[PDB]
């Protein structure tokens, strides 16, 4: 007559994920005009290790199309992607690993 261990998991107290050492959410770039109509070039700067994740994470810097600044996107690294490699994102990008 006691609430069992899998029913206690949804209350989310001691069963939350341990998120201090993670690098951030790995997402694609936002689907904007540049990716919808052409492409955009970013740069792999670091291939780092994400805690709790078996896959390494690429940090890819793109130029902001509308302001003068840099946008750092966090990608899941594909095998063969290296630091300093240009990554192309968009409709007009080519068939290369990492694009």
Residues that bind RNA (CB under 7 A): 1-5, 7-8, 11, 13-16, 19-20, 67
Least separation in angstroms between CB 2 and RNA: 4
Residues at the contact surface with Mg ion, assessed by CB under 5 A? 2-3, 5-6, 16, 19
Instruction: Pick the closer one to Mg ion by CB: 6 or 94.
Output: 6
Which residues are within 8 A (CB) of 70 and not within 5 positions of it... i.e. 6 or more apart?
Answer: 61, 62, 63, 64
* Least distance from RNA to the Cβ atom of residue 71, Å: 11
CA distance 36 to 13: 42
| Shortest distance (Å) from residue 23 CB to Mg ion | 15
| Alpha carbon 93 to its chain's center | 19
SS3 84: coil
């Amino acid at each position: 007559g006691r609430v069992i261990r899998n029913q206690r998991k949804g209350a989310g107290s001691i069963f939350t994920s341990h998120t201090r050492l993670r690098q951030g959410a790995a997402k694609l770039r936002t689907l904007d005009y540049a990716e919808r109509h052409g492409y955009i070039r970013g740069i792999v700067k670091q291939i780092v290790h994400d805690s709790g994740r078996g896959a390494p994470l690429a940090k890819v810097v793109f130029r902001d199309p509308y302001k003068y600044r840099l946008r750092e996107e966090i990608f899941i690294a594909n095998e063969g992607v290296h630091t300093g490699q240009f990554i192309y994102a968009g409709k007009k990008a080519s068939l290369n690993v990492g694009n």
